[PDB]
Scaffold this active site. Structure first.
Site, PDB file in Angstrom:
ATOM      1  N   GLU A 149      23.383  18.936  40.942  1.00 20.58           N
ATOM      2  CA  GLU A 149      24.391  18.201  40.186  1.00 20.58           C
ATOM      3  C   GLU A 149      24.883  19.072  39.045  1.00 20.58           C
ATOM      4  OE1 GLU A 149      23.926  13.708  39.501  1.00 20.58           O
ATOM      5  OE2 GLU A 149      21.853  14.315  39.940  1.00 20.58           O
ATOM      6  N   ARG A 169      17.415   6.605  46.014  1.00 24.13           N
ATOM      7  CA  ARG A 169      17.014   5.209  46.146  1.00 24.13           C
ATOM      8  C   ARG A 169      15.583   4.916  46.577  1.00 24.13           C
ATOM      9  NH1 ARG A 169      21.321   2.860  50.081  1.00 24.13           N
ATOM     10  NH2 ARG A 169      21.967   5.045  50.371  1.00 24.13           N
ATOM     11  N   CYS A 199      23.900   6.904  46.635  1.00 22.04           N
ATOM     12  CA  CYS A 199      22.770   7.431  45.867  1.00 22.04           C
ATOM     13  C   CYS A 199      21.620   7.903  46.743  1.00 22.04           C
ATOM     14  CB  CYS A 199      22.230   6.374  44.868  1.00 22.04           C
ATOM     15  SG  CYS A 199      20.703   6.848  44.025  1.00 22.04           S
ATOM     16  N   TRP A 227      16.974  10.424  36.941  1.00 20.33           N
ATOM     17  CA  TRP A 227      16.802  11.830  36.590  1.00 20.33           C
ATOM     18  C   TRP A 227      17.610  12.729  37.563  1.00 20.33           C
ATOM     19  CZ3 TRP A 227      12.320   8.876  37.815  1.00 20.33           C
ATOM     20  CH2 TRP A 227      11.885   9.006  39.143  1.00 20.33           C
TER      21      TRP A 227
HETATM   22  C1  HEM Z   1      15.766   7.897  39.905  1.00 20.93           C
HETATM   23  C2  HEM Z   1      16.331   9.069  40.225  1.00 20.93           C
HETATM   24  C3  HEM Z   1      17.776   9.169  40.778  1.00 20.93           C
HETATM   25  C4  HEM Z   1      18.222  10.221  41.456  1.00 20.93           C
HETATM   26  C5  HEM Z   1      17.391  11.467  41.837  1.00 20.93           C
HETATM   27  C6  HEM Z   1      19.600   9.978  41.822  1.00 20.93           C
HETATM   28  C7  HEM Z   1      20.405  10.832  42.541  1.00 20.93           C
HETATM   29  C8  HEM Z   1      21.756  10.639  42.611  1.00 20.93           C
HETATM   30  C9  HEM Z   1      22.751  11.651  42.899  1.00 20.93           C
HETATM   31  C10 HEM Z   1      22.451  13.132  43.190  1.00 20.93           C
HETATM   32  C11 HEM Z   1      23.933  11.046  42.875  1.00 20.93           C
HETATM   33  C12 HEM Z   1      25.293  11.713  43.089  1.00 20.93           C
HETATM   34  C13 HEM Z   1      25.916  11.817  41.701  1.00 20.93           C
HETATM   35  C14 HEM Z   1      27.237  12.546  41.706  1.00 20.93           C
HETATM   36  O1  HEM Z   1      27.480  13.393  42.621  1.00 20.93           O
HETATM   37  O2  HEM Z   1      28.044  12.279  40.773  1.00 20.93           O
HETATM   38  C15 HEM Z   1      23.731   9.641  42.558  1.00 20.93           C
HETATM   39  C16 HEM Z   1      24.712   8.692  42.456  1.00 20.93           C
HETATM   40  C17 HEM Z   1      24.561   7.353  42.214  1.00 20.93           C
HETATM   41  N1  HEM Z   1      23.380   6.704  41.859  1.00 20.93           N
HETATM   42 FE1  HEM Z   1      21.527   7.600  41.939  1.00 20.93          FE
HETATM   43  N2  HEM Z   1      19.983   8.751  41.323  1.00 20.93           N
HETATM   44  C18 HEM Z   1      18.878   8.217  40.657  1.00 20.93           C
HETATM   45  C19 HEM Z   1      18.835   7.007  39.988  1.00 20.93           C
HETATM   46  C20 HEM Z   1      19.726   5.963  40.075  1.00 20.93           C
HETATM   47  C21 HEM Z   1      19.621   4.651  39.441  1.00 20.93           C
HETATM   48  C22 HEM Z   1      18.460   4.246  38.515  1.00 20.93           C
HETATM   49  C23 HEM Z   1      20.708   3.941  39.798  1.00 20.93           C
HETATM   50  C24 HEM Z   1      21.152   2.500  39.478  1.00 20.93           C
HETATM   51  C25 HEM Z   1      20.303   1.583  38.984  1.00 20.93           C
HETATM   52  C26 HEM Z   1      21.509   4.783  40.666  1.00 20.93           C
HETATM   53  C27 HEM Z   1      22.680   4.432  41.284  1.00 20.93           C
HETATM   54  C28 HEM Z   1      23.619   5.348  41.674  1.00 20.93           C
HETATM   55  C29 HEM Z   1      25.004   5.048  41.942  1.00 20.93           C
HETATM   56  C30 HEM Z   1      25.681   3.664  41.873  1.00 20.93           C
HETATM   57  C31 HEM Z   1      25.633   6.385  42.312  1.00 20.93           C
HETATM   58  C32 HEM Z   1      27.110   6.653  42.684  1.00 20.93           C
HETATM   59  C33 HEM Z   1      27.741   7.208  41.408  1.00 20.93           C
HETATM   60  C34 HEM Z   1      29.243   7.279  41.487  1.00 20.93           C
HETATM   61  O3  HEM Z   1      29.835   6.648  42.411  1.00 20.93           O
HETATM   62  O4  HEM Z   1      29.836   7.971  40.608  1.00 20.93           O
HETATM   63  N3  HEM Z   1      20.882   5.995  40.811  1.00 20.93           N
HETATM   64  N4  HEM Z   1      22.388   9.429  42.411  1.00 20.93           N
HETATM   65  C1  LIG Z   2      31.838  12.471  40.662  1.00 21.58           C
HETATM   66  N1  LIG Z   2      30.628  13.314  40.816  1.00 21.58           N
HETATM   67  C2  LIG Z   2      30.796  14.570  40.060  1.00 21.58           C
HETATM   68  C3  LIG Z   2      30.883  14.296  38.566  1.00 21.58           C
HETATM   69  C4  LIG Z   2      32.094  14.397  37.879  1.00 21.58           C
HETATM   70  C5  LIG Z   2      32.136  14.153  36.511  1.00 21.58           C
HETATM   71  C6  LIG Z   2      30.967  13.814  35.827  1.00 21.58           C
HETATM   72  C7  LIG Z   2      29.758  13.704  36.503  1.00 21.58           C
HETATM   73  C8  LIG Z   2      28.480  13.375  35.806  1.00 21.58           C
HETATM   74  C9  LIG Z   2      28.308  13.753  34.476  1.00 21.58           C
HETATM   75  N2  LIG Z   2      27.157  13.497  33.834  1.00 21.58           N
HETATM   76  C10 LIG Z   2      26.145  12.889  34.463  1.00 21.58           C
HETATM   77  C11 LIG Z   2      26.251  12.490  35.795  1.00 21.58           C
HETATM   78  C12 LIG Z   2      25.047  11.819  36.433  1.00 21.58           C
HETATM   79  C13 LIG Z   2      25.239  11.103  37.768  1.00 21.58           C
HETATM   80  C14 LIG Z   2      23.857  10.592  38.087  1.00 21.58           C
HETATM   81  C15 LIG Z   2      23.506   9.271  37.800  1.00 21.58           C
HETATM   82  C16 LIG Z   2      22.216   8.829  38.067  1.00 21.58           C
HETATM   83  C17 LIG Z   2      21.823   7.398  37.791  1.00 21.58           C
HETATM   84  C18 LIG Z   2      21.292   9.719  38.601  1.00 21.58           C
HETATM   85  C19 LIG Z   2      21.676  11.032  38.856  1.00 21.58           C
HETATM   86  N3  LIG Z   2      20.779  11.913  39.356  1.00 21.58           N
HETATM   87  N4  LIG Z   2      22.939  11.442  38.587  1.00 21.58           N
HETATM   88  C20 LIG Z   2      27.433  12.744  36.477  1.00 21.58           C
HETATM   89  C21 LIG Z   2      29.723  13.963  37.867  1.00 21.58           C
END
Ligand code: HEM
Ligand SMILES: CNCc1cccc(-c2cncc(CCc3cc(C)cc(N)n3)c2)c1
Ligand code: HEM
Ligand SMILES: CNCc1cccc(-c2cncc(CCc3cc(C)cc(N)n3)c2)c1
Ligand SMILES: C[C@H](O)[C@H](O)[C@H]1CNc2nc(N)[nH]c(=O)c2N1
Ligand SMILES: C[C@H](O)[C@H](O)[C@H]1CNc2nc(N)[nH]c(=O)c2N1
Ligand SMILES: [Zn+2]
Lengths: 408, 413
Positions: free
Chosen positions: B288, B114, B111, B283
């Site tokens: 994304e 963070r 993430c 957010w």
């Molecule tokens: C507050 C603004 C936040 C921003 C700008 C942000 C940004 C991102 C982005 C760009 C990703 C990559 C998502 C993807 O490619 O699918 C991500 C993944 C992730 N975020 Fe953050 N995030 C935010 C909040 C949070 C919060 C509140 C949590 C948990 C309490 C969190 C935990 C995670 C985790 C665990 C992933 C990995 C998701 C996965 O493995 O599919 N994030 N975040």
């Molecule tokens: C695996 N990453 C690519 C992917 C594949 C399929 C679905 C998704 C997806 C669909 N809807 C919402 C998300 C949001 C992921 C996310 C979570 C959080 C907490 C913050 C953020 N900026 N973005 C991802 C992303």
């Protein structure tokens, strides 16, 4: 056991068996991954390595354990005894160099690995000899614009005290000058090397794109300067197909990408001087050389001429400028009939190459961090391709910069 | 293993020293002989497995509040021990639950957002018993987090796993997603990646509008029971129609997206306790949507359609027509979100904030685990500062983990 790599665009899965062949460390452990870290002999050490490589060779020409194979193993043995080293056959040199390319995890260009012109320069004894060999390399590889992959291999390391080294990290680079007012003319990443050349007698024309001289070290001696004859150095004026003001930026790059600071390891022998060259992927120049903040850094300038609003980052003005810069680079090289590959075509070829290697070889070591291009990552197919990274031998490895380990 | 590991920034030459990797708990998938750094994914805990895990977390908690070795610390240790001995599990205090959730985010290697980790609203839903109750809790989350466009990060934590046959699960991988419908001729309508889940919903009773942007119902499982469908009240789903500051034809593409990114398929592990239903939201980073949702070939795949309306030479790839279209698309996403005052961050701002975040973490905490492959944006990589930053990746607990998809494991009643 067997490992699987998935593509998340195509859902194609491949099975890697080849990784069971490696021995050299990745740097990672079970608890810590260093996948984004850039930089992570005696008779009894040298023989098993030699043994493995020779065995590998005869396995590849389909006669493992042949009479040829037997004498070869004996030949190598007696030679390490009485000289603490051994010399590769010509056929073993060429094989070992092609497979070092083939195993280069960080190279996206590897579909070409078997088409490689190998120049044996193991009879070299002086820097003048080295210069001559490198000049022929450059002339051959450049080929008036129809570039050809080449490697020139100098004498192997013996005692550490009598090393062959090309001190230039690449054969063709531009100079970098440290202005009084604090700014920088030329390539700011070369300022140190550029000043080492000046300190050695090089007369700098103090311009923006000044070809650096060669600095060649033969047999452990102090290095010597040589100017590559200009007609051997192919360069390309960068212009845009729509923006007629782009030529007024005054940009050029060289056509030949040639890495000369690495070490070629074959059968436990170390070739400390082994310049190798291919042709450019457009992003190397358009993105990294030109737009890296620590390099030529032209993004703001280009954004100016594109009349872009540059107050907030969310206008993505940098992104727009970058795409246009890279269009020009491709267009210029293509207009000039100088070989160049775009990152879409290159990554496509690489996925095809991966498929080939899994099919016939049971895997293909690849470094995702390096393979994915520095722009438009996920609209290229390697972004969505899981890759396994492991270290196969023969290989290209990093070595200390010579100016850190040289007594004069 | 080495006590001090160095990482380098190749743009600034700044060198940082990591000691925190020493506290790494579980495995990366890498070995000395192979690196799995680009691999996406490389019946309960026993009494004796749980004891050290609980103590580890409790020690960590009382260290954070500057009460390590205090009376309250030893008492809490003794109390947790007795509870594990008698009931084979234990319950977190509210303070501990909040601490653990904030640190799972803090520890989330993948993430980039963070920097915000300590500002997270934690909703304790451990008293939830039914699917209807899950739905009420999730709706409150959505409304709170959405905040009329001024989004606030939040997590809702449902009851922990017990014997494994009574799991709480959100079957949706994300709280808000668009449906995908596969046609007879093999064309897809809506979000093509979502056809499997959409078919599940339809089988469960959903009446599908068969449109391009149909918000999916929630599929909610309480206490191991078969999941139940609920429609999120449409007024709670904030949406942004995509338009372009320059190209007036862009709005004619009929594109829009949802404002709230919320992941609901992951498992939160705190002190050896497993929370299988813990939807969290933040957010969006623009890319994304602009790059992945909209331009992945397996997703909405609009590069071609946008290229055509931009009058681009699409014969040669070396014209970089894809690249040019991508930039404009991501410009329009950021423009549409800002205009409607819905919180969004561009990939330049986010990655710069992450570097500042990481540096502060090295200084105060002795490290900051990060997954370069995920942190670096999927467009314009090297003109963001994270590209040039060396990162160590390792797994600290508390953490968010992946878990099997529930339709693959559920035993239907
Ligand atoms: C507050 C603004 C936040 C921003 C700008 C942000 C940004 C991102 C982005 C760009 C990703 C990559 C998502 C993807 O490619 O699918 C991500 C993944 C992730 N975020 Fe953050 N995030 C935010 C909040 C949070 C919060 C509140 C949590 C948990 C309490 C969190 C935990 C995670 C985790 C665990 C992933 C990995 C998701 C996965 O493995 O599919 N994030 N975040
Ligand atoms: C695996 N990453 C690519 C992917 C594949 C399929 C679905 C998704 C997806 C669909 N809807 C919402 C998300 C949001 C992921 C996310 C979570 C959080 C907490 C913050 C953020 N900026 N973005 C991802 C992303
Ligand atoms: C033939 C066309 C080739 C193409 C299109 C190509 C493409 C690339 C690119 C884009 C890089 C990244 C360079 C950087 O970011 O600094 C690279 C790296 C590399 N290439 Fe290739 N390459 C080619 C030929 C070759 C040849 C002929 C060899 C060896 C004989 C080779 C071996 C390597 C090695 C060892 C690296 C890693 C460099 C490093 O670690 O700094 N390549 N290649
Ligand atoms: C470390 N990677 C980025 C970097 C930093 C500093 C200099 C360079 C560099 C300068 N000039 C030429 C190169 C050649 C790289 C290369 C080598 C080969 C064999 C093929 C190719 N396409 N490109 C690299 C690259
Ligand atoms: C194979 C590769 O690991 C996969 O495509 C990853 C690459 N990096 C990513 N990075 C982010 N933020 N999100 C992703 O879905 C992915 N996908
Ligand atoms: C820190 C990080 O490993 C470093 O910036 C790498 C990332 N990927 C790269 N990829 C290529 N092709 N060339 C590079 O110089 C780099 N630099
Ligand atoms: Zn690794």
């Amino acid at each position: 056991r067997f490992l699987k790599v998935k593509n998340w665009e195509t859902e194609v899965v491949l099975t890697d068996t080849l990784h069971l062949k490696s021995t050299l460390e990745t740097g990672c452990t079970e608890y810590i991954c260093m996948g984004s870290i850039m930089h992570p002999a005696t008779k009894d050490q040298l023989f098993p390595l030699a043994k493995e490589f020779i065995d590998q060779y005869y396995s590849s020409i389909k006669r493992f354990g042949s009479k040829a194979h037997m004498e070869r193993l004996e030949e190598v043995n007696k030679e390490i005894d009485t000289t603490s080293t051994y010399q590769l056959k010509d056929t073993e040199l060429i094989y070992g160099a092609k497979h070092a390319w083939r195993n280069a995890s960080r190279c996206v260009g590897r579909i070409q690995w078997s088409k490689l012109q190998v120049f044996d320069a193991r009879d070299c004894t002086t820097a003048h000899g080295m210069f001559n060999y490198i000049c022929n390399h450059v002339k051959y590889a450049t080929n008036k614009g129809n570039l050809r992959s080449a490697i020139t291999i100098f004498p192997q390391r013996t005692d550490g005290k009598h090393d062959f080294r090309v001190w230039n990290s690449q054969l063709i680079r531009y100079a970098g000058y440290k202005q009084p007012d604090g700014s920088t003319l030329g390539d700011p990443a070369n300022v140190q090397f550029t000043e080492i050349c000046i300190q050695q007698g090089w007369k700098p024309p103090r311009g923006r794109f000044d070809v650096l001289p060669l600095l060649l070290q033969a047999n452990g001696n102090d290095p010597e300067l040589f100017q590559i004859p200009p007609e051997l150095v192919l360069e390309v004026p960068i212009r845009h197909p729509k923006f007629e003001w782009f030529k007024d930026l005054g940009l050029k790059w060289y056509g030949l990408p040639a890495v000369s600071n690495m070490l070629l390891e074959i059968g436990g022998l170390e070739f400390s001087a082994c310049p190798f060259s291919g042709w450019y992927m457009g992003t190397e120049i358009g993105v990294r050389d030109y737009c890296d903040n620590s390099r030529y850094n032209i993004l703001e300038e280009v954004a100016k001429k594109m009349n872009l609003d540059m107050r907030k980052t969310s206008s993505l003005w940098k992104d727009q400028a970058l795409v246009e810069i890279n269009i020009a680079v491709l267009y210029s090289f293509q207009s000039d009939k100088v070989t160049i590959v775009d990152h879409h075509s290159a990554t496509e070829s690489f996925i095809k190459h991966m498929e080939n290697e899994y099919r016939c070889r049971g895997g293909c070591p690849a470094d995702w961090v390096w393979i994915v291009p520095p722009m438009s990552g996920s609209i290229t197919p390697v972004f969505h391709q899981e890759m396994l990274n492991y270290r196969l031998t023969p290989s290209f490895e990093y070595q200390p910069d010579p100016w850190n380990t040289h007594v004069w």
